[PDB]
Amino acid sequence: NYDSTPIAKSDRIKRLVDHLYAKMPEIEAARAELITESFKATEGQPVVMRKARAFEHILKNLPIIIRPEELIVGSTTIAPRGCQTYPEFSYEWLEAEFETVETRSADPFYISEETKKRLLAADAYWKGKTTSELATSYMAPETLRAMKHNFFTPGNYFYNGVGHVTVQYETVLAIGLNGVKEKVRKEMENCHFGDADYSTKMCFLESILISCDAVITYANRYAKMAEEMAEKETDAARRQELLTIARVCKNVPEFPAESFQEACQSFWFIQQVLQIESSGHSISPGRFDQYMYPYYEKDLKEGSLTREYAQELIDCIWVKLNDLNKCRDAASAEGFAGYSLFQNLIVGGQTVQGRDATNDLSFMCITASEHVFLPMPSLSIRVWHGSSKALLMRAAELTRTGIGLPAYYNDEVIIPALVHRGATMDEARNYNIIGCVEPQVPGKTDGWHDAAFFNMCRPLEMVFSNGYDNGEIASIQTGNVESFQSFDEFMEAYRKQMLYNIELMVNADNAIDYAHAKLAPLPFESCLVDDCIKRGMSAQEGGAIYNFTGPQGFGIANVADSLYTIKKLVFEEKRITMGELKKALEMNYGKGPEDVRKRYEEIHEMILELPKYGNDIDEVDELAREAAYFYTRPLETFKNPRGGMYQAGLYPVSANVPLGAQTGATPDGRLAHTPVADGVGPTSGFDISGPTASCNSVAKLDHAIASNGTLFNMKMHPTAMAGEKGLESFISLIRGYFDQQGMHMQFNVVDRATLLDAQAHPEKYSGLIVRVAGYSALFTTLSKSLQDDIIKRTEQ
Amino acid sequence: YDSTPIAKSDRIKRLVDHLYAKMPEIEAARAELITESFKATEGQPVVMRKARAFEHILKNLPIIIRPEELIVGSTTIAPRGCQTYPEFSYEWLEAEFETVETRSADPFYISEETKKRLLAADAYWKGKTTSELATSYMAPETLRAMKHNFFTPGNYFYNGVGHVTVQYETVLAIGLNGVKEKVRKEMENCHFGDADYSTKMCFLESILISCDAVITYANRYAKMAEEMAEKETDAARRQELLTIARVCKNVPEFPAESFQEACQSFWFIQQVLQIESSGHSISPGRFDQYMYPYYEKDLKEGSLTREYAQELIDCIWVKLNDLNKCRDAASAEGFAGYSLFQNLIVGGQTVQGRDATNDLSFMCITASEHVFLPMPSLSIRVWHGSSKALLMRAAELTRTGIGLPAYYNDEVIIPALVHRGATMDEARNYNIIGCVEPQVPGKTDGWHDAAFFNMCRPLEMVFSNGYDNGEIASIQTGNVESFQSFDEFMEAYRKQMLYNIELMVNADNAIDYAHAKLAPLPFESCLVDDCIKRGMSAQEGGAIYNFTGPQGFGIANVADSLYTIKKLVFEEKRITMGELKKALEMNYGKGLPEDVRKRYEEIHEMILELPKYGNDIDEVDELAREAAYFYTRPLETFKNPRGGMYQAGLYPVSANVPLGAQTGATPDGRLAHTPVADGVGPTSGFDISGPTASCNSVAKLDHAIASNGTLFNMKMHPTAMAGEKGLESFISLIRGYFDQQGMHMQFNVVDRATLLDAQAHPEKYSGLIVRVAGYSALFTTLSKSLQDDIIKRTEQ
Structure with a gap:
């Protein structure tokens, strides 16, 4: 009941893309000035009313622009891929980076001298008023100690x-x-x-x-500008387009969409103003092929829309999704590298009635990715046993281009996971993905799906150092490591170290939660989420039906193998004493006195020859399953102030690299300061048994209890996907993992020499995209250390 | 117990005379200190900021030991001065800088330096006050009803x-x-x-x-006492200072070990509570019960004499008159006489239901007599097992004309408290808050004086069909000339009452949110169950019992008004409804053609000749009962944001005069702009059948349903109490009223000529006290219009 044939690309699309990238991303001060102006005028009023008034003032006065040849309009900055600033949360980090942000290694932004001055002036009002400051005050001293270490x-x-x-x-x-x-x-x-x-x-x-009237006023400013630009437009066709844009923006989003272009423009306006109201990212379009479909179908049947134009509209939206941007402090930026906003858009899956949901748009979204070929949106596909074979083959074809898309999600595990946390069957069936890999019932959830990064290796280190770090006490004292008499004692020591620090993370996240509830309720985002209107409170305060907090655990592979080393080299075979393993770790295996350096290389080398996680070896993989439980099981027992539950997630973004930089040498063989594992998959270079065996290991973890989502990266050589037979074996690989309750999979399809050459001649690989983790990015906009991490990942 | 009065130290008059040597003066020190502190704690949670400000104030507030004081603790350098409280409001004060020294109700001196200091400190609080937030939370209809x-x-x-x-x-x-x-x-x-x-x-x-601040505060006094004691040449005073020094080092930090320690400990808490916040009716309550164990142990160990115990108590009494509070001019007329309504009660029952009379019960009554100041608002609990000796001693005090004590009926109050949720054990331990409001002590956030509601203004709205000054002021209940039965009129009145009562609940709830969000109080809260356990302030719902208690005015006026309408318009048809309406408009022609004027006067005269409320006339009184219910019954159905219930109260403070000033003529014969009735008692000069008949009428109201408390004023001539025969008929009068389930009585005992002489020569009567309503005041500190209302009251 659909046409799977690809629709042709408009020559417009490349010109739109090129224009986005003509100049460096730029920070602008207009939003900061307007939010300050408004708040100054509304002192004395309730917070949520001041937030609405500020949203109103921002949208009434923010500079707007229609970029050349845009069909879908709505820009947040004058500069393509620029950002505004958000002093209501924090700003001191930005002021500190004024002189460096343009040339910093991760996600540099240009900022003019005049903007610096304007920001300094507007920011000053927000000292002592930010959510970050209130959050800080609400954290225990032990929590701040834990974050420092x-x-x-x-x-x-x-x-x-x-x-x-x-x-x-x-x-x-x-x-x-x-x-x-x-x-x-x-x-x-x-x-x-x-x-x-x-x-x-x-x-x-x-x-x-x-707030609603603000967005309507905002759309109407574009109608007015489109009318004005139309009168000055020499190109007759373009003139007509601007006139159409003018009429469309007078209708949506105020009134129900009456055509496909209106639904496209209405959608984009919502997508855009949410990220003006708040700098929260992972504003995820979700099941776009589903809710856009009736508007597409009505229009196509009444003859007034062609497939080509419909494809062009979607293509334009794809581009617009890359026009938005956000500047994070330099340290944070390394954890979110590549200018992503993690706007997840998913196709396929099941209807509420449990039939296949594939339609014409499902295919057109995949094509939009190919046409635009930019990092965003984070295109995703829902997979279930009744999936359209055509849609899967189409997705496989996109993945084979090397763009890293779509990510594949397993209905068969996600739907029951959602139900087990309180979703009805009807609701779970309608899920989509948030951000990287986090499942959600849409329009009913305040999910906090990326609440924290938790490093599972740092408690393991604390077992060895009995709670000391950097000479100072940094954690609880589980005992002198050399006095443990069995592996089960050491495990218990680890479990405790994990538990204590998990509870502190919950303290951090709960502190921040109160800060947003108190200082940053969002009237506009809330009115579009059940049950805020009826309960009379924002999503930040408990208005949503479902409330979660989802923090991410890092380094399952590293921890699993580390525990195997300890179990089998120290306690069973006794080829190494606990004491000399500890000093080996201390000295980084002697990699940066020659008896001992060689003695440490020897220790290092017998560790690297142990069997590793990701080769379908039961005795190693069971330690992975159990170590994952040391994070996922305690977490699901804590509550948040919005009335909801914590739920573990296991995905890295790009933060496995900076987190690794903060981690000394571990018993798995990993060297100090080097990246920890990405997601739940095996450590790079340790999975040597091919992809099927890899999938079998990873599938031994309990994924469903990590209901905030798991991430499994894999990298194919391009000839593995060659021909129709390649695409079909690719699908079988995915289906094999999914049949074993695996949650998610995503693929780089790239030759190693391509990436090495992109490093040596970046100017020649301007358009090269790679999969980072749960998102794609332009390779040459990534720092060298993150490039190196992507490059060293196992090629199948 | 021993009932013989203890003698009076010559110290007491010197202490009293020092309180009154100069005008009450407004000081700026607290405003500066709270501004200093809040400026430095921005970004911290509100309750922490309040704690820190309380801390900063108590560390740096100027202190002083007044000459010859035994109990120390002053809030202002000037005796009977006040600090200011910009965190609630300040603009009214700045508006009164030039006039507050010579205003007619409760004037205060303010130096030019103080004005400058206040202006500088206040500027920070613009947009940060509870009053601004409360305003923003009130409906437009609520603001209109308040305007009218x-x-x-x-x-x-x-x-x-x-x-x-x-x-x-x-x-x-x-x-x-x-x-x-x-x-x-x-x-x-x-x-x-x-x-x-x-x-x-x-x-x-x-x-x-907050607790450490109060300990610090007492210790500043210990240090000052020691310093003064070094330069004190009178050997006996020097000894007093050393003893003070030792006392303030132990209390309130540590358990009181002697009666003087208990006294000083009490007073510090009484005092700093009113530095933390400007809320008044901070009511000592069952002082004779909880002070008794410390007195008793100290007496039987021989360490303490009855003379010295009495002297300490007298000193506390003096101190209770040292605190003061400046209200805006309008509001001052409703709380006239510089009162803080600090209610202290004696007698009643133990939790086991036996008479609770002890030595201190008699000594508290004696203290009133000794000091002879307006505060404390001495009260006594009366029940069927009351000690006759205590009642007689109370009767003696009342005979002096001081207006004390107020008499409260356990037999009505205890069941009323139980019906609102108190346990029998708790209710038996009740005391009075402020004027007449019963409470379970240490477990309640009662909001016992939340608003003044004028029951006559909705009655006026029936005649005018919701109009006032040509503009809409309320709902339209119908043209008054088209009601063709008295029951239709009553129904119209009931709906006017219902509509405006709900708006009042809106006003109070708005204010409730403002305090909960901007002014939680850590120190007050920690001395009230169950804040500590629940982890929340009493402003937020930490207290076990939560109420809001708004006051209805004009029961007698409304009762008689409805009687007039019933008999004269509908039953005897002596007047047309339209002509009664004109009569009210023209204030009975008491201020036209002459034929018209004396027509209205003729109508006035026959209304005056009607039987009235307060004469045991059943047909008039059942209307008083029913009218009261139009107020007390709908109010008990409303809730407050602290999770508690509204409960109606019926008492006037001194507000019957300014409220009366805002009310046109009424069908009862009351002329325009003249005071409405004080409490639940008969209109002045309308009760002409004796006091027993008066009591009989007033006991026909439902007092229990008004569980926030009712007030019944009465004035005796001094010769009515003369001799022991007088004291016993006096007691019998109260018992007679209480036996019919009246809640409260209080008395003026005074010759008319005395009050008039006090108006003609106030310099002669600086010591003269009168009973106002739920409190006593110095007569010559009252405005002329309030003096006149007290003068016009019925003498029995």
């Missing part, structure tokens, strides 16, 4: 907004912001003056009204 | 809440050191990962800081 970092929602949500796009498309406002006025009628919650509920609902 | 003087919530709007009896006995028994211990113990129940850890721990840390 790099056990975990909650930087993400500490420095900037939350996001990580799939909003009700379909509700805006179906009833417009007009309809949402009507839903609000209707709820207002249920409120009576003497109700104990009248004051806060009505102020929240009024705030939605102001 | 249907009610006023000014009390907690402009200044703090208070209205609480804390656990004094807990401070006396375990000291603040023990309280800190109680907090630290609760902290061990809190784990890093608990969802409420951040907020609970921050709250508990704040209690610690």
